[PDB]
C-alpha cells in the first residue's frame, strides 16, 4: 500500500 | 495501476 511502509508491512507478515 | 506485489517486493530488497 501506498500509505503503509515496507519496513512494518515487511515484519508482521513477513 | 502499478499494482505493488508484496512477494516479489518482501525478497528483492530486504
Same mark, same amino acid.
Given at each position: &500500500?501506498?500509505? $503503509? $511502509? &515496507?519496513?512494518?508491512?515487511?515484519?508482521?507478515?513477513?
Amino acid at each position: &500500500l501506498p500509505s $503503509d $511502509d &515496507l519496513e512494518f508491512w515487511c515484519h508482521v507478515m513477513y
